[PDB]
Amino acid sequence: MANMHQLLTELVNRGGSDLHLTTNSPPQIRIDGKLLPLDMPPLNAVDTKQLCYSILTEQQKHKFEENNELDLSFGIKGLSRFRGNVFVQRGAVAGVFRVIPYKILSFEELGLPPVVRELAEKPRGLVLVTGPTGSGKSTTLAAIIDKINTDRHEHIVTVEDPIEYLHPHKSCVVNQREVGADTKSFKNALKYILRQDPDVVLVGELRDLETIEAALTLAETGHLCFATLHTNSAVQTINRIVDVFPSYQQPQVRAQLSFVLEGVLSQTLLPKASGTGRVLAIEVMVPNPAIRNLIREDKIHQIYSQMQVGQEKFGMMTMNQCLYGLLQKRHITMDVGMGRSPDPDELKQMLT
């Protein structure tokens, strides 16, 4: 297991995002999104199995061997937590491991504007931070969470599969439930969450319509609800959300959403223009009454225009506006911003 300790130590030490372990390759680490093979012998099935098994319970070993899959989380005392996935490929064990720092960075350390912190003082509603896997969403969510834990005397509940970031008690009481151990299911967690007197809730992935209904109920019943999506924009998010429902319930969903929605963020971690480190590009939508009317009226497409003009009033920001700030600040290259701009000529006009 000592080898594994050193690989995770190097992952941490090298600012690496993720460690990949598979047979016939040396361990490889993703740093700022790119793989680097380590100067190590190629792994065999014995190596991957013994190292991965060194951090498993008898039940977890039984579980992976029962399913050839295992999602899990674990902590290394004095170092960090990690999220692990173990699987089987070509008849051999393989593993992927995500870092979870013990220390959650602040908005300014993350390059996040102050308006998210003011959102952290909201007593209730749903504010969404979206983007692909590992785009800092759990980390961002954890920063907002830690700020509330520090600042409020409220009840924070998280439901996670598995628990990633740990939020020990500050000013809040924080309870963190791992699905399949602490609670039978997300569904079971929702079966008991209203009897646990929460104020703030982390619900994990918006996996199905039922979870969406649960989130709408939570945000409308006096709770602060946090959730994630893998969508890339506010409009794409809203269309995705409406269309999961049968046609007859989308009117209600639009009214509900207009009432309970407090924010939509769509974020990504990009390689920095300097060639070292990664930088966050984020599109920000803050609903105003006009936007809430657009939500109720099924006039989704014009929402982009509100984000184009909500910079001064509400701190809103289209992705192109974020690319503009990163480009003037030389945080990103011209090609990535233009390659993502829905109107590259527009971003040029904003830049010049």
Site for a copy of itself in 303-342 (CB under 8 A): none
Q: Which two tokens stand for residue 35?
A: 């793989």
Q: Specify the stretch interacting with ligand ATP by CB under 6 A; choose among 21-29, 60-68, 133-141, 321-329.
A: 133-141
Q: Specify the stretch interacting with a copy of itself by CB under 8 A; choose among 140-148, 169-177, 277-285, 324-332.
A: 169-177
Using the minimum distance from each CB to ligand ATP, give the nearer residue, 138 or 341.
138
Report the residue from 10, 32, 65, 178 that binds a copy of itself according to the rule CB under 8 A.
Answer: 178
Q: What x-and-dash track marks residues 79-98 binding ligand ATP by CB under 6 A?
A: -------------------x
Are the C-beta atoms of residues 307 and 301 closer than 8 Å to each other? no
Q: Phi/psi of residue 49, each to 5°?
A: -65, -45
87 binds, among ligand ATP, a copy of itself, none (CB under 5 to 8 A by kind): a copy of itself
- Tokens 């509100």 sit at which residue? 306
147 binds, among ligand ATP, a copy of itself, none (CB under 5 to 8 A by kind): none
Residue 138 CA to residue 104 CA, distance in Å, equals 10
Residue 79 CA to residue 165 CA, distance in Å, equals 13
Query: Does 134 help bind ligand ATP (rule: CB under 6 A)?
Result: yes
Is 296 annotated as contributing to ligand binding? no
Is 106 annotated as contributing to ligand binding? no
**CB neighbours of 29 closer than 8 A, spacing ≥ 6?**
7, 10, 11, 14, 16, 17, 18, 19, 20, 35, 36, 38
351 binds, among ligand ATP, a copy of itself, none (CB under 5 to 8 A by kind): none
| Termini Cα distance of the chain | 55
Instruction: Kindly state the smallest distance separating residue 226's Cβ from a copy of itself, in Å.
Output: 16
Distance, C-alpha 260 to centroid of its chain: 20
Report the residue from 73, 139, 231, 306 that binds ligand ATP according to the rule CB under 6 A.
Answer: 139
Using the minimum distance from each CB to a copy of itself, give the nearer residue, 78 or 246.
246
Task: Write down the number of H helices and E strands in the chain.
Answer: 16, 13
**CB neighbours of 218 closer than 8 A, spacing ≥ 6?**
126, 193, 201, 203, 225
Report the residue from 197, 208, 210, 297 that binds a copy of itself according to the rule CB under 8 A.
Answer: 197
State the burial class of residue 104 (Cβ atoms within 10 Å of its Cβ: 0-12, 13-18, 19+).
buried
Q: What x-and-dash track marks residues 39-78 binding ligand ATP by CB under 6 A?
A: ----------------------------------------
| Residues 23-42 within binding reach of a copy of itself (CB under 8 A) | 24-25, 28, 30, 34-37, 42
HEC string of 39-107 equals CCCCECHHHHHHHHHCCCCHHHHHHHHHHCEEEEEEEECCCEEEEEEEEEECCEEEEEEEEECCCCCCH
| Residues 121-150 within binding reach of a copy of itself (CB under 8 A) | 132-135
- Binding-site residues for ADP sit at 83, 98, 110, 134-139, 195
